[PDB]
């Protein structure tokens with residue numbers, strides 16, 4: 241009834257600016273290939289209707305579900321079948337099947353042109369119309385990242401406004417803007433891959449998967465909070481995420497504000513670090529809570545062995561409520577160990593489960609489970625050795641070299657995967673050395689495992705849409721928690737049948753010389769994957785040889801008088817020599 245006017249409710253809660261930015265973000269994530277101009281028209285239609293409903297909630301159609309009015313507007317796009325083909329058959333369904341149908345067509349890899357920041361243009365547009373400028377930013381990020389966490393995206397537009405405000409008054413605009421745009425881009429991609437994982441985890445493993453993970457993570461952040469408080473916040477947070485992942489962006493933002501306000505209302509029970517956040521306006525306040533540091537572990541917490549090893553009544557407590565007991569173990573263990581990664585803590589709780597499953601059936605269980613922490617130690621040693629061996633590799637070779645060593649590893653593990661994905665994934669895995677290796681001791685394992693989760697999740701998303709490795713299938717779907725170690729344990733796929741040498745990847749036109757350093761690296765790393773797809777067992781000496789000849793060749797032609805001529809006429813020599821080197 242009254243609150244059947246969901247659209248009026250949302251508009252009242254969020255205010256017009258946020259309402260519109262959220263509706264814009266929604267259209268952009270569902271119809272990633274429509275122009276801004278079109279999306280602005282749809283947002284204005286729905287805002288105008290919301291305003292009619294606010295004035296009068298009994299107006300016709302004002303009682304429809306917000307998500308229904310929104311799906312109806314999507315279906316009312318004339319080019320819908322021309323552009324999105326099958327997507328239009330979504331329209332023939334009732335909700336919530338219609339939406340689940342639309343969501344299915346969200347495109348994780350839409351391959352839209354690269355935005356190349358032209359600072360003077362950016363600044364002319366920003367000066368012309370600040371509000372259109374920000375809209376075009378939301379649209380452009382949102383269409384590229386159809387699962388971006390919508391309220392954070394509103395936040396980024398507000399935050400970076402100060403950028404343009406200061407930078408666009410300067411004469412040397414590009415010196416001011418370009419470093420900041422780079423940093424903006426960094427946060428955005430980080431944020432995107434994080435939200436992508438939250439959505440994949442809900443969709444492929446269930447809401448409970450994301451809850452477990454959140455319980456670990458918040459217990460580290462708010463180690464003084466009570467289990468029941470963590471539980472309340474995680475559930476409310478998981479609803480917010482499920483809503484954003486399902487395209488319910490207004491309800492998602494509305495629920496998040498409520499959560500931010502609840503966390504500020506109760507900060508004394510939660511963390512003293514929250515004081516910084518709580519006098520801020522709503523988007524910054526939520527951002528600031530999402531980013532707050534771990535509070536200090538309180539004094540006087542009993543040793544974990546008191547409740548979970550020494551205690552003679554573990555088996556009783558576990559059999560009486562298996563799930564609460566493990567949840568509680570997870571909370572207790574997480575609060576005391578901010579230095580452990582979330583997934584390591586989840587792996588610890590699973591192994592603990594396994595142990596009690598075995599131990600409680602036994603004659604005398606207490607003797608069996610009392611040494612459980614000795615059993616668990618390997619789950620902490622292995623991530624540690626991973627980090628140790630990889631960080632020395634990274635520092636021995638630097639980022640690009642480290643990327644190249646993972647190119648070799650990953651092509652072997654998953655040779656069926658497409659070369660652009662193996663290059664993209666391997667370059668990100670190597671950047672995990674750049675982001676994590678130099679961090680403090682108590683940050684290295686959380687940082688390493690968290691970025692590995694984000695990048696393997698990106699591999700799983702791409703792969704699940706066009707499956708070509710049974711092994712990558714296995715590691716993606718068998719267990720969210722064991723993804724990283726499942727991937728880590730892969731050896732050369734002995735099932736794989738080598739492809740013939742693909743020469744095009746070792747032959748070039750003159751415009752290779754003109755490429756940015758990154759694109760040049762990508763060309764080389766692409767060649768590298770191709771070497772291995774052809775000869776997965778090539779020796780390091782062969783690979784270095786080929787790649788040294790490759791760089792040598794490009795140098796030589798790029799320095800020629802006739803570049804094209806040297807590439808085309810000499811190019812067959814690199815091909816010939818490369819093959820001779822693989823004999």
Ligand SMILES: C[C@H](CO)OC[C@@H](C)OC[C@H](C)OC[C@@H](C)O
Pocket residue numbers: 257258260261264280283370371372374375394397398399401
């Ligand atoms: C579609 C329409 C532009 O005409 O809305 C986009 C606009 C309201 O952006 C909202 C976003 C939160 O703005 C950024 C801040 C700094 O104004």
Ligand SMILES: C[C@H](CO)OC[C@@H](C)OC[C@H](C)OC[C@@H](C)O
Pocket residue numbers: 438453454457458473477496499500526527529530
């Ligand atoms: C209001 C604001 C929403 O993003 O609060 C978030 C805060 C409670 O924690 C975010 C934290 C990093 O958990 C994310 C996990 C669930 O992947």
Ligand SMILES: C[C@H](CO)OC[C@@H](C)OC[C@H](C)OC[C@@H](C)O
Pocket residue numbers: 448449451452455471563564566567568570586589590721
């Ligand atoms: C909210 C809930 C307990 O009430 O916490 C999640 C609980 C099932 O964690 C147990 C354990 C970590 O599960 C291992 C799986 C989810 O990876």
